[PDB]
């Protein structure tokens, strides 16, 4: 969707509260 | 054993170096691996413009010595200096 | 195509049922865009599958009608089915087994009835066992048809077998490619007729090849009394192909014959286009002639050397030829004397 | 030659000129427009040829193009069916230097062809096949407008309609390889038109022969070659030896295969085991050489597909034409599902074929209407490094592993 | 004029160089870098050397840069630059 | 005779005479030895020394006397088209006052020689000096009055082509910042008076700005444009700075159009600030960088109206500083003492990567790096060229280095974050 590829503050957010649920578990 | 081989590769893929043809003492396009009637046509203009740029090295000096005459020419600009041995192309773009 | 990419972007993620109201309310949107695919896929099918550009493009891709038919009923076929499993899929278990579903699914057997290949190949049965031709042997079949309005008899010499029998053996080929159901007597006759065509099509080049000789005659009759030996050459290979038979076991060898007839033939016209070209130019010149007798000279040198070409040609008539264009040469004479 | 090569040779002025090369080193050591190189130069039709002299009536026999001269392109028309007055064999030519509309030479021919190949082997000449079937030789040297050669097509020649063929080996050794409509696999001398230097009418499947619809035979591939059934049948084509033949038919299609060819693009990824195939049924279905199944697939139009070929240059990129009259080429890395840039066929015309250029810079375009474009090409994404052709081999074994994955999860996933 | 008397001036500002002259076809020099009457012997030798490497140019091609053409000789680097009506050669060090 | 003399004087012949000298010095440049060894045995001792210093490294001297005198290096502009230009704006010059006030000087990156290849003379002093970014062959700047001059590189006469209107309406004011901006189908000649005529010109029209703007905020409190930058892609987002130390955002669009933010951290008239050049594998548009005449360099970001963070280390009031074109960590600055102060954050932070302050104090006022920032053109006032060159250790910047800037920013927040809860807590009750 808006990955890093050829900023978006939003998506960065979900993307880290992603990797720190995982983090979490 | 390869030298003139190598010096031919050299100023052949030099930058650009449109071809450097060994022509004979006379001038006449002795290597000429590719078109022979516009090759041998350059040569033989080229002794010309040679025999014309003695001419001028004589109203300076005859027997003066020559490094390379850098004749500024669109199509093909030389950097050379012909001889009564032998003809090897040096022509090569000032911007490369 | 966005149906698609949704359920592409989703896929991953049915684990969590965050999205499935979502797509409960947007399966009215999914039915929508269905529903206008299933449109516009009747809309095609409406189209006739010959009338379809495509179905020219095909035919150039060798495709023979019934054949060109059969294979658009089986894409549309094919298509169809895809976009029920897609649908099916986008609507998940029971994509079908809903009600909206269900009926999707019952339009769909509707459009495969209409899609009827079934039918369509029963028709094209029908129709080949209704031809249910078969001829051999004088395969030169001579046809003498009238001119369009005219009563000139235009000799066809049609060969021991029909362009619609070419047609069936290679949607023969195409039928066994889309699992058709075909007539076993039909397809041992088809491989005689197959058989035939080794030399058939070398029948029907040659047909070509003599309409094109008689179309460079007709070009140029004015050197067409040069070339009479050439011309009696294909007469009488014309009358032994007229009285060959393919029950006869030579019609191979015969053929053979025929085409080495037909090349020579063509070669023939050729030099006999290089010559025409040589003599008109010479005409010319004679007609334009500057006032030199050195040009008059040099006119007749390339004369001489026109003739001595034709002298190593050994065309038809060759003395006769050569009083006509000295006849010619005295009437461009007399019209510079007159000058 | 050797008074030359002496020269070159000769002791004195081999030193001096070693020591004057040595010296000379020394001494000598519209604006907009190029806002669209990714952004339509990529794919600009340029060269519309539509010379009506063979434009009206007539179709695309196939197409071709000069190595030798590779500013020359063949434009192969086919039969005037509309024209039956006008010749059904007759050759065009488009000059990508020169912006002229004429051949360069018009190889006539009595018959309707189906297709042609010019000679980088022999570049005085070419070649072609009837849609009939009987093969043919022309050469631009020549004054006769008909092919001198014509190899005719017989009961002991191809009798089936010929549509695959073409000039195998270079000047070296060249053995033109033919194909009837049964395919038969036919090399043809670099000189001899009377005897082929082979022929075979190839079968498979218990000998049960089909109709080869595509071909292709990998890069200096003497002994191998593609052989793609009508019926879908993809067979593996060995080419020279006793094990030539139609060893494997692959089934990686649903239709006639619309187009195929050998994965042409070179870089640091090798590309042997890909195989790029095209089906008749509306599906475009790239397969495999080990795996015989498909290896991924693209079939967007309802219509079927004009053309189908691997890029060149780029792995990632893709030439193929279909014939819902849209372009189809697709950059793997960049975009796989959709394409790169579907641009549309003008008035949706009906394609027949596709040439592109030696440089990439440019591919031709098929046109039933008749004016016969072509599209100036590139850099932007044709162009692939060897890095880029690493990402593309990296891209490949990611695709291989999304497979396995389709794979498992379909068996893991299936409803019942 | 002035400016091309400084642009001369500024290719001679390289001290040791033995002549450069800004020359003409008329045997005579715009602005040479010599005494008065060698000046104008060595500009009739550029006078007749320009009209014979116009000459030479036209039978190599007569579509060239119609400006100059070097000679970087070991004796000295003549950097001749006839203009269509003006003209100027420097017969000049190697080095610069 | 005269016959030669007005042949000098012809204009086409002149001309002739001019691109012939313009070739000889191309071909004389190109004229290399031929005793040349390339093998690089004259290195070694350079490779001795490369490791204590090669990230500096000055290439030549675009130094002259025939408008260099009296004449600073007013502005600085690498040519975007050939790279391989840069300008030389100059001062008024007060030794040659029978000279103009402005003759514009190129500095040459495709040869190494002292004549300029393109000279743009006039009688007021370059203020502003912007370059074609859309164009090959055109020159235009600020003069000491405002009206914007106009001139051509590939022409023969260095006089002002056209002139940009002179009137109350027009550029009262000295034509502080100006600039080619706006697309290449919508374009936007943009410049900045002192009193705050912000003007969007036309290149084809030099009478009537395509937008004037005299800018005013905090009660229409007069704007004083100092620091001069603005966004890529938003041609209605620009930088202002206050010679009374205040930054603001610029809007060119909008009800607002003009002074958009308000910022305010520095203790001097704003002397160099350049937007954050580099663009990586992270996007960094809300953030800047500002210096002052205070011996300090301010960070500045998008949302901070307090400096984002301070290099202060400068001994001395700061003229100029920009931030590197390719490397995030990288920043380049300048002042009055030659205060070459390139300073990589993620290599050096507490000390600049290479802060070299000229000896003798040399004036280095404006200057511009190159396009790819592999060399930077640094000069005194009375004209003491350098273009150091850039070791590519130190210039490249890694690949993780616009993430690990992002880290390193984010760093930053935190340690920015414990310095403002410290001054939370040090307020006594």
């Given at each position: 969707?808006?990955?890093?590829?050829?900023?978006?503050?939003?998506?960065?957010?979900?993307?880290?509260?992603?990797?720190?649920?995982?983090?979490?578990? | 054993?390869?030298?003139?081989?190598?010096?031919?590769?050299?100023?052949?893929?030099?930058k650009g170096v449109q071809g450097i043809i060994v022509v004979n003492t006379e001038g006449?396009?002795?290597?000429?691996?590719?078109?022979?009637?516009?090759?041998?046509?350059?040569?033989?203009?080229?002794?010309?413009?040679?025999?014309?740029?003695?001419?001028?090295?004589?109203?300076?000096?005859?027997?003066?010595?020559?490094?390379?005459?850098?004749?500024?020419?669109?199509?093909?600009?030389?950097?050379?200096?012909?001889?009564?041995?032998?003809?090897?192309?040096?022509?090569?773009?000032?911007?490369? | 195509?966005?149906?698609?990419?949704?359920?592409?972007?989703?896929?991953?993620?049915?684990?969590?049922?965050?999205?499935?109201?979502?797509?409960?309310?947007?399966?009215?949107?999914?039915?929508?865009?269905?529903?206008?695919?299933?449109?516009?896929?009747?809309?095609?099918?409406?189209?006739?599958?010959?009338?379809?550009?495509?179905?020219?493009?095909?035919?150039?891709?060798?495709?023979?009608?019934?054949?060109?038919?059969?294979?658009?009923?089986?894409?549309?076929?094919?298509?169809?089915?895809?976009?029920?499993?897609?649908?099916?899929?986008?609507?998940?278990?029971?994509?079908?087994?809903?009600?909206?579903?269900?009926?999707?699914?019952?339009?769909?057997?509707?459009?495969?009835?209409?899609?009827?290949?079934?039918?369509?190949?029963?028709?094209?049965?029908?129709?080949?066992?209704?031809?249910?031709?078969?001829?051999?042997?004088?395969?030169?079949?001579?046809?003498?048809?009238?001119?369009?309005?005219?009563?000139?008899?235009?000799?066809?010499?049609?060969?021991?077998?029909?362009?619609?029998?070419?047609?069936?053996?290679?949607?023969?080929?195409?039928?066994?490619?889309?699992?058709?159901?075909?007539?076993?007597?039909?397809?041992?006759?088809?491989?005689?007729?197959?058989?035939?065509?080794?030399?058939?099509?070398?029948?029907?080049?040659?047909?070509?090849?003599?309409?094109?000789?008689?179309?460079?005659?007709?070009?140029?009759?004015?050197?067409?009394?040069?070339?009479?030996?050439?011309?009696?050459?294909?007469?009488?290979?014309?009358?032994?192909?007229?009285?060959?038979?393919?029950?006869?076991?030579?019609?191979?060898?015969?053929?053979?014959?025929?085409?080495?007839?037909?090349?020579?033939?063509?070669?023939?016209?050729?030099?006999?286009?290089?010559?025409?070209?040589?003599?008109?130019?010479?005409?010319?010149?004679?007609?334009?002639?500057?006032?030199?007798?050195?040009?008059?000279?040099?006119?007749?040198?390339?004369?001489?050397?026109?003739?001595?070409?034709?002298?190593?040609?050994?065309?038809?008539?060759?003395?006769?030829?050569?009083?006509?264009?000295?006849?010619?040469?005295?009437?461009?004479?007399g019209v510079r004397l007159q000058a | 030659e050797e008074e030359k090569q002496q020269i070159?040779?000769?002791?004195?002025?081999?030193?001096?000129?070693?020591?004057?090369?040595?010296?000379?080193?020394?001494?000598?050591?519209?604006?907009?427009?190029?806002?669209?190189?990714?952004?339509?130069?990529?794919?600009?039709?340029?060269?519309?040829?539509?010379?009506?002299?063979?434009?009206?009536?007539?179709?695309?026999?196939?197409?071709?193009?000069?190595?030798?001269?590779?500013?020359?392109?063949?434009?192969?028309?086919?039969?005037?069916?509309?024209?039956?007055?006008?010749?059904?064999?007759?050759?065009?030519?488009?000059?990508?230097?020169?912006?002229?509309?004429?051949?360069?030479?018009?190889?006539?021919?009595?018959?309707?062809?189906?297709?042609?190949?010019?000679?980088?082997?022999?570049?005085?000449?070419?070649?072609?096949?009837?849609?009939?079937?009987?093969?043919?030789?022309?050469?631009?040297?020549?004054?006769?407008?008909?092919?001198?050669?014509?190899?005719?097509?017989?009961?002991?020649?191809?009798?089936?309609?010929?549509?695959?063929?073409?000039?195998?080996?270079?000047?070296?050794?060249?053995?033109?390889?033919?194909?009837?409509?049964?395919?038969?696999?036919?090399?043809?001398?670099?000189?001899?038109?009377?005897?082929?230097?082979?022929?075979?009418?190839?079968?498979?499947?218990?000998?049960?022969?089909?109709?080869?619809?595509?071909?292709?035979?990998?890069?200096?591939?003497?002994?191998?070659?593609?052989?793609?059934?009508?019926?879908?049948?993809?067979?593996?084509?060995?080419?020279?030896?006793?094990?030539?033949?139609?060893?494997?038919?692959?089934?990686?299609?649903?239709?006639?295969?619309?187009?195929?060819?050998?994965?042409?693009?070179?870089?640091?990824?090798?590309?042997?085991?890909?195989?790029?195939?095209?089906?008749?049924?509306?599906?475009?279905?790239?397969?495999?050489?080990?795996?015989?199944?498909?290896?991924?697939?693209?079939?967007?139009?309802?219509?079927?597909?004009?053309?189908?070929?691997?890029?060149?240059?780029?792995?990632?990129?893709?030439?193929?034409?279909?014939?819902?009259?849209?372009?189809?080429?697709?950059?793997?890395?960049?975009?796989?599902?959709?394409?790169?840039?579907?641009?549309?066929?003008?008035?949706?015309?009906?394609?027949?074929?596709?040439?592109?250029?030696?440089?990439?810079?440019?591919?031709?375009?098929?046109?039933?209407?008749?004016?016969?474009?072509?599209?100036?090409?590139?850099?932007?994404?044709?162009?692939?490094?060897?890095?880029?052709?690493?990402?593309?081999?990296?891209?490949?074994?990611?695709?291989?592993?999304?497979?396995?994955?389709?794979?498992?999860?379909?068996?893991?996933?299936?409803?019942?």
């Open positions: 969707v808006l990955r890093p590829q050829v900023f978006d503050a939003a998506d960065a957010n979900a993307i880290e509260e992603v990797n720190l649920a995982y983090e979490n578990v | 054993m390869a030298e003139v081989e190598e010096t031919l590769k050299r100023l052949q893929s030099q006449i396009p002795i290597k000429s691996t590719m078109d022979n009637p516009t090759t041998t046509q350059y040569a033989s203009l080229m002794h010309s413009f040679i025999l014309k740029a003695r001419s001028t090295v004589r109203d300076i000096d005859p027997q003066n010595d020559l490094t390379f005459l850098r004749i500024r020419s669109k199509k093909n600009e030389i950097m050379v200096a012909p001889d009564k041995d032998y003809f090897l192309i040096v022509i090569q773009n000032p911007t490369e | 195509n966005e149906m698609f990419r949704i359920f592409s972007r989703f896929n991953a993620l049915f684990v969590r049922p965050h999205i499935r109201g979502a797509i409960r309310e947007y399966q009215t949107q999914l039915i929508q865009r269905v529903k206008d695919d299933i449109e516009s896929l009747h809309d095609k099918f409406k189209v006739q599958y010959p009338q379809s550009q495509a179905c020219k493009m095909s035919h150039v891709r060798d495709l023979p009608p019934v054949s060109g038919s059969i294979i658009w009923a089986k894409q549309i076929d094919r298509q169809l089915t895809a976009y029920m499993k897609r649908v099916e899929d986008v609507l998940g278990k029971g994509w079908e087994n809903h009600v909206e579903g269900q009926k999707l699914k019952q339009d769909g057997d509707s459009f495969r009835m209409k899609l009827n290949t079934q039918e369509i190949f029963d028709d094209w049965a029908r129709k080949v066992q209704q031809r249910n031709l078969g001829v051999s042997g004088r395969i030169f079949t001579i046809e003498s048809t009238r001119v369009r309005g005219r009563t000139g008899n235009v000799l066809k010499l049609k060969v021991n077998f029909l362009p619609e029998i070419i047609t069936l053996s290679k949607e023969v080929r195409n039928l066994k490619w889309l699992g058709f159901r075909v007539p076993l007597a039909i397809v041992n006759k088809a491989h005689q007729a197959n058989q035939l065509y080794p030399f058939a099509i070398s029948l029907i080049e040659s047909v070509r090849t003599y309409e094109r000789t008689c179309e460079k005659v007709e070009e140029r009759n004015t050197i067409s009394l040069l070339v009479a030996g050439l011309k009696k050459e294909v007469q009488a290979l014309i009358a032994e192909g007229i009285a060959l038979v393919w029950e006869s076991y030579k019609l191979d060898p015969y053929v053979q014959r025929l085409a080495e007839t037909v090349f020579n033939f063509q070669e023939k016209v050729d030099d006999l286009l290089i010559i025409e070209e040589k003599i008109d130019l010479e005409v010319r010149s004679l007609e334009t002639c500057m006032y030199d007798h050195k040009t008059f000279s040099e006119i007749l040198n390339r004369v001489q050397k026109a003739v001595d070409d034709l002298n190593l040609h050994s065309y038809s008539n060759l003395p006769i030829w050569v009083n006509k264009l000295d006849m010619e040469i005295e009437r461009i004479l | 070159l040779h000769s002791e004195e002025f081999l030193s001096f000129f070693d020591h004057s090369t040595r010296i000379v080193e020394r001494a000598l050591s519209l604006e907009d427009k190029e806002g669209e190189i990714q952004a339509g130069a990529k794919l600009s039709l340029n060269r519309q040829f539509f010379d009506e002299r063979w434009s009206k009536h007539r179709v695309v026999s196939c197409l071709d193009w000069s190595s030798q001269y590779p500013e020359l392109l063949v434009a192969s028309y086919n039969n005037n069916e509309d024209a039956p007055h006008e010749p059904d064999g007759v050759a065009l030519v488009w000059n990508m230097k020169y912006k002229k509309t004429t051949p360069e030479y018009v190889f006539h021919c009595q018959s309707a062809v189906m297709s042609a190949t010019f000679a980088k082997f022999h570049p005085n000449l070419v070649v072609g096949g009837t849609y009939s079937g009987q093969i043919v030789l022309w050469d631009n040297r020549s004054n006769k407008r008909t092919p001198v050669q014509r190899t005719p097509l017989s009961a002991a020649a191809h009798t089936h309609p010929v549509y695959c063929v073409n000039v195998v080996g270079t000047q070296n050794a060249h053995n033109l390889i033919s194909i009837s409509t049964d395919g038969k696999i036919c090399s043809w001398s670099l000189d001899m038109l009377s005897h082929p230097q082979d022929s075979m009418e190839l079968v498979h499947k218990q000998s049960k022969a089909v109709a080869v619809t595509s071909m292709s035979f990998p890069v200096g591939d003497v002994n191998n070659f593609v052989v793609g059934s009508e019926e879908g049948s993809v067979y593996t084509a060995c080419r020279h030896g006793s094990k030539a033949g139609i060893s494997e038919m692959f089934e990686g299609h649903q239709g006639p295969i619309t187009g195929i060819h050998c994965h042409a693009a070179v870089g640091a990824v090798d590309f042997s085991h890909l195989f790029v195939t095209s089906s008749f049924d509306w599906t475009v279905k790239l397969w495999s050489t080990k795996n015989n199944k498909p290896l991924y697939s693209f079939e967007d139009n309802a219509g079927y597909v004009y053309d189908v070929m691997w890029s060149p240059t780029h792995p990632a990129l893709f030439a193929c034409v279909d014939g819902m009259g849209r372009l189809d080429l697709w950059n793997l890395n960049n975009d796989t599902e959709v394409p790169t840039a579907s641009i549309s066929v003008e008035g949706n015309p009906a394609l027949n074929r596709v040439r592109w250029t030696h440089s990439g810079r440019e591919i031709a375009v098929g046109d039933s209407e008749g004016q016969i474009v072509i599209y100036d090409v590139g850099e932007q994404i044709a162009v692939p490094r060897n890095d880029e052709w690493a990402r593309f081999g990296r891209t490949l074994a990611e695709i291989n592993a999304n497979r396995a994955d389709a794979e498992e999860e379909a068996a893991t996933r299936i409803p019942a």
